[PDB]
Amino acid sequence: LALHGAAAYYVGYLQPRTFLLKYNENGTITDAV
């Protein structure tokens, strides 16, 4: 961080999972299960 200001940060941890991803007609992921 830096010193002299308003900041907030969040940390989470990844696990091996199976996801169902949705691709629209432009190729972007818009939803997941």
């Binding site: 969040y10 996801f19 007609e25 190729g27």
Partner: protein, 36 residues
């Protein structure tokens, strides 16, 4: 040189919830109009 910062109030840690966050593209193949 290293300086140990003082004058910092200690507080209990805080938690929150991730609402369907953290999804990334698994590979580099283009796909469209599909459930994968």
């Amino acid at each position: 040189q290293c300086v140990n910062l003082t004058t910092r109030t200690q507080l209990p840690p805080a938690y929150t919830n991730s609402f369907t966050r953290g999804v990334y593209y698994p590979d580099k193949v283009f796909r469209s109009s599909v459930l994968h």
